[PDB]
Design a protein around this ligand. Sequence first.
Ligand SMILES: [Zn+2]
Ligand SMILES: [Zn+2]
Length: 69
Amino acid sequence: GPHMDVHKKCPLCELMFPPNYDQSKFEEHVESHWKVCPMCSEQFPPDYDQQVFERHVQTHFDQNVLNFD
Ligand SMILES: [Zn+2]
Ligand SMILES: [Zn+2]
């Protein structure tokens, strides 16, 4: 950390943490913004659209109407 080590902010929502905050706890928070499809276990970038993500997740519920096969 430099003279300004208050850069520990989630660049995705700008939640600002103290300089002494856990890097990995920071990263998991960044990875929380990476929207994870529970059915893909894939994390989608913050650059991804929530609308697109929600429709993506919806298609996992849609399942192309899995009737049997
Ligand atoms: Zn955040
Ligand atoms: Zn998915």
